[PDB]
Amino acid sequence: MDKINLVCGSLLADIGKIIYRGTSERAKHSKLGGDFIKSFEQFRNTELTDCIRYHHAQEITSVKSNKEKNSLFYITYIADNISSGMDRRKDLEEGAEGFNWDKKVALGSVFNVLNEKEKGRQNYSYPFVAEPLNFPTATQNQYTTSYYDGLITDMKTILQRLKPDKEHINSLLQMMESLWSYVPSSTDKNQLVDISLYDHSRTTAAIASAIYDYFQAENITDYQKELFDYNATEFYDKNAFLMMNFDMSGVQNFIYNISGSKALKSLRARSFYLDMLLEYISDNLLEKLELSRANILYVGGGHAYLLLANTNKTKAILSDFEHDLKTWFLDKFKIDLYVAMAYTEVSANDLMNHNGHYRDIYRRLSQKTSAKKANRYTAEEILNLNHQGTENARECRECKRSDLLIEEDDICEICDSLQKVSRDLTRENIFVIANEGVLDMPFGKKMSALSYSQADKLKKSNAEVQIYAKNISEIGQNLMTRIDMGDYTYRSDFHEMLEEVEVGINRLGVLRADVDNLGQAFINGIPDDYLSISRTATFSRAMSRFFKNYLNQLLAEKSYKINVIYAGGDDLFMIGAWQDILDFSIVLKQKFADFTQNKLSISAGIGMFREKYPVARMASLTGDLEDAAKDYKPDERAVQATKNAVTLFDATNVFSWDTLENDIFVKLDAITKNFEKLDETGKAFIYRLIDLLRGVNENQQINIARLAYTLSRMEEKIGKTFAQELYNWANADRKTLIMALEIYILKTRER
């Protein structure tokens, strides 16, 4: 039995669900999906049919006599069971003509269950549209048959130009991610629906693939007896899977610690290079293990999670892979960048939460990751590091390294390759990984950012080229691997970018938004009762898609002067117009609140910099402002910090996002509306107020004197309503008034 057939039958497993909810007869959905696949002439090997029509307990009981051993459809069943987690194991199938199945429900956001111990219980949903991202909605939404038929028509269009082959499994995942991302895995009430069909099918395929590899390595050809003839409790207790912990270390130091004259143009290139490194390493490992991309759980933030098979051959491949990757990274990034690979022996009960400590997988994974991150190198790599040391005269301008130095310039191979790519990084661009390229990649490859037009003439039947694209259309033909990241570049020069404002300031504003307690939201935020591999994967992919895709779409919605450097996961870096940073901070907070249903806190930090300020210093200052926002507490009595704050140009100026920021923005809008049109001569009192309120712990005489002067000022004007509202807001809100006034001044300064 071929593995590709198993992967295809585990992926295209619940197509019958959509074909049943859409149109046609109302029979059991497995038969409908099997017929739908059989209608195509290329998915004809009867193994796809066995996996699709027979992946539930009742079907297996109904055909176990006809189908002989090693029939390949026990693996998909025992994989769907693990993917479901706490969900049904033996129950009536969808559309069994025995229950009025609620064939109109949409999948809710997994933020309904998130932090239900202290943030309540709700049931939201994703409305159907036509990308773009669907925010959770308070109103109850129902999916229409027309949406189902559109999905069916697009699926029939795509699957016609598809094959059950290794190179087309990626296109199958792309089609599933595009279409099924917003349709539920199950359609009923009194249970949970938030598990998407894309996540469910991808997890099922990954589990089935790992189980097949483990069975093949252990030389087992008794799938029925091991899995279905009994409760499979023996297989459940024993360990069969692994979970890798690819963790790239020192990304911040590799990216931000630079000192070039054109360094601002390079941070996007550095972040893109690191994301490409991580994704290419994950894909190459998956190829080495003869595994599809369904086995990848999460990629982003220099962190990859893969679900492997616990076989001695797999562990040997992992050891050799780690040796090769460590040697390559040592060759390129001596210690300035390093990836730690650690895997934990995980059984089926651990993922399916039978023991009640599913989180122990990640506990021991983090323990092994930290252990390898401490004793990183053996006492031969250190000898090589200290012996490959040479006294030099020249060094890299940014990377400040004397090896890998280009002959004609004081710039390092990395240090000019990720300037050529930054020059060549535009929109409607794809990314290729061929033996000839511009950016170095491990395992003797290189990557380029060539346009889609040159892609056709680039392949020329070159076996593997690893085409990477930001956008995917016509999924079936022109196989490509879709990669997402922050790629909103209104203008990539940062000087004409800044000199587009007419009234404002000549400062460079930046944003560093970090989600608060996301690690805790993973450790204990998700309920223990609702703990599953599919649900965790759904939450992870929802957060990653939110960040990358929706940051891109939100910036592309209308004209924003932002040149986003990094989105990835749990983090955010932005450089653009100062007022654009300020007015997009509120957009970011409101969009995060809407998408996460006010369950996860976020913190930011904004800094003003000149046109030639050190970008490493920019990043370090914005990071320590971000920390000053992270350590915010209204009162010094409760344990731990609220973390829900924003620092506005100063570490000491820790404001909030709550009613406090509401007040500061209401004040800013009121001041902007009122103080545009003065007598244009009495406005000189504004700097008087600013410099006499800069700090009030000293001679108070001048403050009450200015109060008396404001009272004294008497002519025909707006009156003294707002002229005394200034006094009213001048006592209760001191720091608030100075902050709002300085924001107003910077916005309205004739500079």
Partner: protein, 297 residues
């Protein structure tokens, strides 16, 4: 034992790789470089190298002190015995320096995580925008990363068996500054050898886990012994050789990778003074001997 307290009268630049940023402490190789430069100044570099290479003067690096609270970089414990309670997460990640008397309390748990960081406040990093004025060309704006300490705050160096020659060198190092832009208005301090009593007990103690207190590189013989159940971290110690009598131009030195001053080991190793400048006409040395603080988990 012999806490050398350094009181700075001007902001310091203790740069790590570039001039635009400064770090708050200097390492032991920086201090040995400064003292070797002084010894070359008064003509006894050979005796100083003999003393330091015969372990007669071995020192840790510079740690912060605040109001007679001697601080130490967060030791790299395996944290295998704390997952039961407290916060085995990023709470103990922003914490950079812990006090050295409260280490056994921290090691066994019970030290506040949030409280320390605001308690740990010694000055702040500063920008220093400078230029190279050119009469007719354009001026060259550059900035120097600096750091100013508080009034009752500075750095302290652990030295075992202080030496008359070392005392003579530290007098000369007052007036030549320490750090990056010392000939500019930045490096400046006064020191006190300041024998201490509650500290020598910590280094007269015993225990299974050893805390490396100086950026050290093991000898080729004991690297295998030291790299067993160790939680360490490497760091490149390179840059440019600071001497006007070396290689007749501005040449870099062989980058050396050493264990950081917060690493923890089960096997005590004695590091080495490393020849990192060979092609020049004087031996450029990297002080990488080992200075430990044994604890028991």
């Amino acid at each position: 034992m012999k806490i050398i307290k350094l009181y700075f009268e001007s902001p310091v630049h203790f740069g790590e790789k570039r001039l635009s940023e400064s770090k708050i402490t200097f390492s032991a190789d920086t201090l040995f470089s400064a003292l070797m430069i002084e010894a070359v100044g008064l003509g006894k570099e050979d005796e100083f190298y003999q003393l330091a290479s015969n372990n007669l003067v071995k020192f840790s690096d510079a740690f912060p002190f605040i109001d007679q609270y001697y601080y130490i970089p967060k030791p790299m414990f395996n944290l295998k015995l704390e997952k039961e309670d407290e916060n085995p997460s990023k709470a103990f990640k922003k914490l950079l320096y812990v006090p050295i008397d409260s280490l056994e309390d921290y090691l066994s748990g019970g030290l506040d995580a949030y409280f320390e960081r605001e308690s740990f406040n010694l000055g702040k990093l500063a920008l220093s925008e400078k230029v190279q004025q050119h009469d007719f060309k354009d001026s060259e704006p550059y900035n120097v990363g600096t750091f100013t300490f508080k009034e009752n705050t500075g750095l302290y160096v652990l030295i075992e068996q202080t030496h008359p020659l070392l005392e003579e060198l530290l007098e000369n190092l007052q007036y030549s500054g320490i750090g990056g832009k010392r000939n500019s208005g930045y490096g400046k301090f006064k020191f006190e050898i300041l024998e201490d009593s509650d500290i020598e007990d910590l280094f007269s103690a015993k225990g299974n886990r050893k805390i490396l207190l100086s950026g050290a590189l093991p000898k080729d013989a004991e690297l295998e012994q030291a790299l067993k159940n160790a939680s360490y971290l490497l760091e490149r110690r390179g840059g440019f050789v600071q001497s006007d009598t070396y290689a007749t131009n501005l040449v870099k030195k062989q980058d050396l990778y050493v264990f950081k001053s917060g690493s923890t080991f089960e096997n005590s190793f004695d590091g080495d003074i490393y020849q990192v400048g060979k092609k020049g006409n004087h031996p450029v040395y990297k002080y990488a001997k080992s200075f430990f603080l044994e604890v028991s988990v």
